[PDB]
Amino acid sequence: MNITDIREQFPILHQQVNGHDLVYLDSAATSQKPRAVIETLDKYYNQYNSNVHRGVHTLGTRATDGYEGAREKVRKFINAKSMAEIIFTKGTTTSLNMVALSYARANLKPGDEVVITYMEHHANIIPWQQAVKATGATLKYIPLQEDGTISLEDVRETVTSNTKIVAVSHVSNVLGTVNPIKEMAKIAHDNGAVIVVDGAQSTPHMKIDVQDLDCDFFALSSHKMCGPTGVGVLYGKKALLENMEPAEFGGEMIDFVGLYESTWKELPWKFEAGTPIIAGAIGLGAAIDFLEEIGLDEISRHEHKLAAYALERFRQLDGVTVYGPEERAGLVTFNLDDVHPHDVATVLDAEGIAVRAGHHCAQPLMKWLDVTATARASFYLYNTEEEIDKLVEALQKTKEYFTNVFVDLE
Amino acid sequence: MNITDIREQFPILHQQVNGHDLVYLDSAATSQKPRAVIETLDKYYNQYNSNVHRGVHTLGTRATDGYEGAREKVRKFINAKSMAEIIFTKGTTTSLNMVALSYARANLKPGDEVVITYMEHHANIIPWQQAVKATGATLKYIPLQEDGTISLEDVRETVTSNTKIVAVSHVSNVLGTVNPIKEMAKIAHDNGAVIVVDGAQSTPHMKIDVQDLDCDFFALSSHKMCGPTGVGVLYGKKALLENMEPAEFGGEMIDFVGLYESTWKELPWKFEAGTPIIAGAIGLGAAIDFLEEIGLDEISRHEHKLAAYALERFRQLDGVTVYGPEERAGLVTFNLDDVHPHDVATVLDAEGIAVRAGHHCAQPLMKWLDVTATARASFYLYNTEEEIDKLVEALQKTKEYFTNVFVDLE
Ligand SMILES: Cc1ncc(COP(=O)(O)O)c(CN[C@@H](C)C(=O)O)c1O
Ligand SMILES: Cc1ncc(COP(=O)(O)O)c(CN[C@@H](C)C(=O)O)c1O
């Protein structure tokens, strides 16, 4: 896996920021796109852009072929059984909301439990809050161990026979934890519940097998896996998606429309109201082709390489706290002793290094960590060990600078 | 307004389809993009792609600036008062659904009336069906006159003091009708109702002034107005959007998140859950700049030119029925005597002409017209009179062909 060859595919990497070479370490917020994706979009808008499922003309046929072929590529990419289980959405947040919607609106009664975790992204928290509010059900949290992992026994004790939904992250955008999705799915099925995997931060970096995970729902975002913004995927088990009512209504999802009553389409289009994200989905299919040609397991090996390297180099800096397990997906959330994370991020950007600072849409986890904010650096398949070297050098320089400014206090 | 210069901006137009020069007459399903939009997307993914409202680094700042500047361009483009009234959505269908959602979930009681029309696109029908179902309210239809327009007196008689929502198209995707949105908004306000304008088919072709229309909600789709797929806009009066609850929940729309309770953000982000359609919105802003530089009133003049020309040339063909008024937005929905519309569309595509055939997501209107399906040709700012000449020549040739095949029946 030659990473110079891969980096040469991403034009955005080859620029300077504030006089320094760009060091992008914020892929967990959004990823960059290779020439293959951008040129897929260009070819779409230059040659065969048309609405799909409507006009029965040549450009319409090409666009329909592209969109549904993207659907098939997504099906292959996560080993779903049928394209009917692959629903194009706006992103992971929308997919989780769609499950929260048809569950709440039809399968939640008082006494039923929805169990989540303290590490969940807000997208995997608030929909369940609102659903249990609307239905009178109960919201429960799975506690975390002190290394930021989840114990299977805490799961088994928290999920009871009254649980209808277990909702859990595949990979934590803050701690780097990889959760035991398979065992948790088995435990949820033992208790008669479905399992909803937020796979937003796993899909870009590791192989997904929904058959092996036996997840009932899986949500992913294209903009993290080298794909266009504005598109993502909901996977649901076909049997479940048949019995869920649509979250949106309009064209492309109806069969018969009367003045007062309508019938829906078969899957997947039942859950795709309106003109779909045609270009975005075709570009996501291109992104999938790109990753599969690089190899997902090679990407996993590269990310474990970078994460072990980053962890080892962070322990070489005094006065830095890293949060989460040693076994991780390759992201480092941390803080500097007596330096605010926002300030860290600002000084890193003055060195051309891009990190995130704040709560990372995980306020309960921040409170659990007993911090108000944090800094995070996130790695992907275009990131190098030299970049982590640059990061840790800039962290040392930052701490030296704020010590040589603390001292200058008269 | 030089239209050769404009056509030279659209690379997709300069190709052949099935041996013939492409004649795209299906802009009402989706429009084509000028170099300015595609190159805006390219510049985004090549130079400053990053998530916006999160990382506080330079590329993040550029992307945030682009996204919110697109919001301001949309605000100017439709003369909204505040960016807080401009919400980025997936498209017109989603915006209408969002109004249907927060109205149903909080402002509809039994006895309340939601009034629509027989000409409404399915996107502006089914959400109201489902909302009155969930709330026990009543759904009413405004009848149409025999030329496919709406009489103001039928509106006044159909909307009563128990009406909370009047939902109506600005321009009909089938009949070409331009509805009296302003007078209808006044009548709805007189009865204490809000008015929801489906402006999906008006925004690309004519100037929008939400202040002059006094609409309470306005929905539009980017892919019709030379902009990217997968993005659209909901406009709501700020006072109304403050009191509506969000349709989606997750990051970017919260302020404080507790274990069980959360508070929302201020407008507009209250209604934008998750990573937004960054590239799509920036490209939509580019599309708006493009149209404003061409001039919306020049586009209206051009479309009235093409529609009058098309109507006059259609009356020159015997055995063709055109549906709708003489005063129109420039689209022609029609049928050939003893030729099925799908067949018409197929033969036109063999001549390289792109039209739509079917019900155009307006089944109640099709039944009202007493037809099961129809053919439609739709014009935009890159379409010429020569193309309508080609269309009517191919229609004459089609009818000659099916007469010289009816005769060959032994
Ligand atoms: C008046 C109107 N409203 C709403 C829509 C659909 O909204 P979306 O942008 O989300 O698709 C359309 C699209 N028509 C298309 C479907 C057509 O002409 O066949 C429309 O013409
Ligand atoms: C685990 C997880 N779930 C869900 C989301 C948001 O889904 P969208 O693709 O619709 O944004 C994110 C994005 N995180 C971003 C916000 C971050 O790292 O700050 C995420 O990391």
Side-chain angles (χ1 to χ4, degrees):
Chain A
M1 176 182 158
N2 188 285
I3 164 166
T4 300
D5 287 3
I6 289 150
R7 288 177 57 92
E8 146 74 12
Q9 278 297 113
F10 296 74
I12 191 148
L13 296 188
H14 310 94
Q15 64 181 301
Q16 300 215 154
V17 164
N18 301 19
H20 289 252
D21 278 6
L22 171 67
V23 182
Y24 187 77
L25 303 175
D26 197 16
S27 296
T30 206
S31 66
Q32 308 292 356
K33 332 294 165 193
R35 268 171 227 287
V37 173
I38 308 172
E39 288 179 359
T40 290
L41 293 170
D42 296 337
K43 198 205 186 200
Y44 177 77
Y45 288 121
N46 292 328
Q47 305 189 352
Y48 61 110
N49 163 73
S50 275
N51 195 19
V52 298
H53 299 131
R54 334 280 151 150
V56 200
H57 50 87
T58 305
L59 293 206
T61 297
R62 278 151 193 194
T64 302
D65 285 336
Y67 182 73
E68 294 293 332
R71 199 191 302 281
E72 166 64 9
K73 299 173 166 176
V74 175
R75 190 208 52 81
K76 260 171 210 169
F77 186 64
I78 73 170
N79 200 35
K81 285 171 174 159
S82 166
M83 273 175 304
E85 309 180 302
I86 298 308
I87 297 156
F88 280 123
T89 77
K90 213 176 72 62
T92 297
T93 299
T94 289
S95 308
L96 295 174
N97 267 271
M98 286 173 57
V99 176
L101 248 199
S102 318
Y103 259 83
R105 295 210 192 194
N107 204 147
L108 281 186
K109 295 321 218 133
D112 291 345
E113 300 163 349
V114 169
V115 316
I116 59 184
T117 88
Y118 290 113
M119 73 169 81
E120 291 301 323
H121 190 285
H122 292 161
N124 208 18
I125 288 173
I126 311 139
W128 313 117
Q129 286 178 174
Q130 294 301 312
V132 305
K133 271 188 175 254
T135 60
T138 301
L139 183 61
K140 293 166 97 196
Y141 284 83
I142 292 155
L144 303 191
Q145 306 200 101
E146 325 187 321
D147 72 337
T149 62
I150 297 172
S151 86
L152 285 186
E153 191 62 32
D154 276 325
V155 178
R156 295 196 205 92
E157 161 88 337
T158 305
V159 59
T160 79
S161 300
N162 286 334
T163 304
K164 305 281 151 158
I165 299 167
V166 178
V168 60
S169 189
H170 195 174
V171 169
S172 165
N173 67 304
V174 172
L175 299 151
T177 308
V178 181
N179 282 319
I181 289 308
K182 183 159 139 173
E183 301 79 8
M184 286 181 78
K186 175 263 185 295
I187 280 147
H189 292 355
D190 286 343
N191 281 85
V194 287
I195 188 159
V196 181
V197 184
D198 171 11
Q201 201 72 236
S202 63
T203 309
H205 313 290
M206 59 185 285
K207 205 191 177 216
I208 301 298
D209 192 335
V210 300
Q211 316 272 38
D212 175 72
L213 298 160
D214 198 33
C215 46
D216 307 295
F217 302 92
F218 190 88
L220 65 89
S221 282
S222 147
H223 68 104
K224 274 92 171 303
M225 50 177 298
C226 299
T229 66
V231 53
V233 175
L234 176 59
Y235 161 83
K237 279 172 152 169
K238 198 171 183 300
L240 298 163
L241 293 172
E242 295 284 9
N243 283 282
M244 298 167 42
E245 287 265 281
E248 276 196 324
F249 307 95
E252 192 187 47
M253 64 76 46
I254 50 84
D255 208 19
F256 170 89
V257 192
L259 288 185
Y260 310 101
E261 304 281 345
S262 309
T263 65
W264 318 137
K265 294 219 108 148
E266 31 179 338
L267 298 172
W269 312 284
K270 173 163 109 168
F271 282 104
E272 299 184 353
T275 308
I277 316 146
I278 304 159
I282 292 170
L284 171 61
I288 282 157
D289 296 342
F290 174 79
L291 297 177
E292 300 196 294
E293 254 205 327
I294 288 187
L296 261 286
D297 281 351
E298 295 284 294
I299 293 159
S300 301
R301 270 154 226 169
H302 184 69
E303 278 194 33
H304 300 167
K305 209 193 63 158
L306 298 185
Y309 192 76
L311 293 180
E312 191 212 342
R313 304 285 272 118
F314 265 69
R315 270 192 298 271
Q316 302 177 348
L317 310 153
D318 43 318
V320 191
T321 305
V322 169
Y323 306 94
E326 261 269 306
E327 213 81 50
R328 71 175 48 224
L331 62 99
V332 176
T333 286
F334 67 100
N335 255 321
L336 256 179
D337 288 355
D338 295 327
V339 187
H340 193 251
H342 190 246
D343 287 325
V344 177
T346 296
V347 190
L348 262 48
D349 185 65
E351 300 291 299
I353 298 151
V355 300
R356 217 207 131 184
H359 59 210
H360 314 292
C361 300
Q363 271 175 12
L365 177 60
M366 293 299 117
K367 216 213 190 213
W368 181 94
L369 291 171
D370 209 24
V371 300
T372 55
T374 177
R376 184 191 68 196
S378 34
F379 321 122
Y380 205 7
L381 79 171
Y382 36 64
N383 289 130
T384 71
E385 292 171 335
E386 183 221 70
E387 285 172 335
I388 287 150
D389 290 342
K390 286 194 198 160
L391 169 66
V392 288
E393 286 156 24
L395 285 180
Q396 177 62 24
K397 251 65 217 183
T398 308
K399 96 143 82 161
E400 276 157 32
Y401 167 98
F402 275 98
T403 279
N404 301 158
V405 171
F406 172 88
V407 159
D408 305 355
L409 291 207
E410 268 56 35
Chain B
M1 176 182 158
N2 188 285
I3 164 166
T4 300
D5 287 3
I6 289 150
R7 288 177 57 92
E8 146 74 12
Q9 278 297 113
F10 296 74
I12 191 148
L13 296 188
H14 310 94
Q15 64 181 301
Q16 300 215 154
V17 164
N18 301 19
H20 289 252
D21 278 6
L22 171 67
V23 182
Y24 187 77
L25 303 175
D26 197 16
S27 296
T30 206
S31 66
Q32 308 292 356
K33 332 294 165 193
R35 268 171 227 287
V37 173
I38 308 172
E39 288 179 359
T40 290
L41 293 170
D42 296 337
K43 198 205 186 200
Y44 177 77
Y45 288 121
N46 292 328
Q47 305 189 352
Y48 61 110
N49 163 73
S50 275
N51 195 19
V52 298
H53 299 131
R54 334 280 151 150
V56 200
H57 50 87
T58 305
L59 293 206
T61 297
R62 278 151 193 194
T64 302
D65 285 336
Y67 182 73
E68 294 293 332
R71 199 191 302 281
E72 166 64 9
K73 299 173 166 176
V74 175
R75 190 208 52 81
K76 260 171 210 169
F77 186 64
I78 73 170
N79 200 35
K81 285 171 174 159
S82 166
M83 273 175 304
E85 309 180 302
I86 298 308
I87 297 156
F88 280 123
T89 77
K90 213 176 72 62
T92 297
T93 299
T94 289
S95 308
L96 295 174
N97 267 271
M98 286 173 57
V99 176
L101 248 199
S102 318
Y103 259 83
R105 295 210 192 194
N107 204 147
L108 281 186
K109 295 321 218 133
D112 291 345
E113 300 163 349
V114 169
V115 316
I116 59 185
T117 88
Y118 290 113
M119 73 169 81
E120 291 301 323
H121 190 285
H122 292 161
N124 208 18
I125 288 173
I126 311 139
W128 313 117
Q129 286 178 174
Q130 294 301 312
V132 305
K133 271 188 175 254
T135 60
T138 301
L139 183 61
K140 293 166 97 196
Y141 284 83
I142 292 155
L144 303 191
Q145 306 200 101
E146 325 187 321
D147 72 337
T149 62
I150 297 172
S151 86
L152 285 186
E153 191 62 32
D154 276 325
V155 178
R156 295 196 205 92
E157 161 88 337
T158 305
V159 59
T160 79
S161 300
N162 286 334
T163 304
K164 305 281 151 158
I165 299 167
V166 178
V168 60
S169 189
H170 195 174
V171 169
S172 165
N173 67 304
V174 172
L175 299 151
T177 308
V178 181
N179 282 319
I181 289 308
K182 183 159 139 173
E183 301 79 8
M184 286 181 78
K186 175 263 185 295
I187 280 147
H189 292 355
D190 286 343
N191 281 85
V194 287
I195 188 159
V196 181
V197 184
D198 171 11
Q201 201 72 236
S202 63
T203 309
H205 313 290
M206 59 185 285
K207 205 191 177 216
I208 301 298
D209 192 335
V210 300
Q211 316 272 38
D212 175 72
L213 298 160
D214 198 33
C215 46
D216 307 295
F217 302 92
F218 190 88
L220 65 89
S221 282
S222 147
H223 68 104
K224 274 92 171 303
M225 50 177 298
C226 299
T229 66
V231 53
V233 175
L234 176 59
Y235 161 83
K237 279 172 152 169
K238 198 171 183 300
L240 298 163
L241 293 172
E242 295 284 9
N243 283 282
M244 298 167 42
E245 287 265 281
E248 276 196 324
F249 307 95
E252 192 187 47
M253 64 76 46
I254 50 84
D255 208 19
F256 170 89
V257 192
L259 288 185
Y260 310 101
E261 304 281 345
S262 309
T263 65
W264 318 137
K265 294 219 108 148
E266 31 179 338
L267 298 172
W269 312 284
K270 173 163 109 168
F271 282 104
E272 299 184 353
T275 308
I277 316 146
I278 304 159
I282 292 170
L284 171 61
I288 282 157
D289 296 342
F290 174 79
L291 297 177
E292 300 196 294
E293 254 205 327
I294 288 187
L296 261 286
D297 281 351
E298 295 284 294
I299 293 159
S300 301
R301 270 154 226 169
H302 184 69
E303 278 194 33
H304 300 167
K305 209 193 63 158
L306 298 185
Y309 192 76
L311 293 180
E312 191 212 342
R313 304 285 272 118
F314 265 69
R315 270 192 298 271
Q316 302 177 348
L317 310 153
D318 43 318
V320 191
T321 305
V322 169
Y323 306 94
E326 261 269 306
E327 213 81 50
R328 71 175 48 224
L331 62 99
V332 176
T333 286
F334 67 100
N335 255 321
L336 256 179
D337 288 355
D338 295 327
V339 187
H340 193 251
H342 190 246
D343 287 325
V344 177
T346 296
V347 190
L348 262 48
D349 185 65
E351 300 291 299
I353 298 151
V355 300
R356 217 207 131 184
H359 59 210
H360 314 292
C361 300
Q363 271 175 12
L365 177 60
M366 293 299 117
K367 216 213 190 213
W368 181 94
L369 291 171
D370 209 24
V371 300
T372 55
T374 177
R376 184 191 68 196
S378 34
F379 321 122
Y380 205 7
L381 79 171
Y382 36 64
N383 289 130
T384 71
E385 292 171 335
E386 183 221 70
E387 285 172 335
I388 287 150
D389 290 342
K390 286 194 198 160
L391 169 66
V392 288
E393 286 156 24
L395 285 180
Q396 177 62 24
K397 250 65 217 183
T398 308
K399 96 143 82 161
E400 276 157 32
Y401 167 98
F402 275 98
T403 279
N404 301 158
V405 171
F406 172 88
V407 159
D408 305 355
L409 291 207
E410 268 56 35

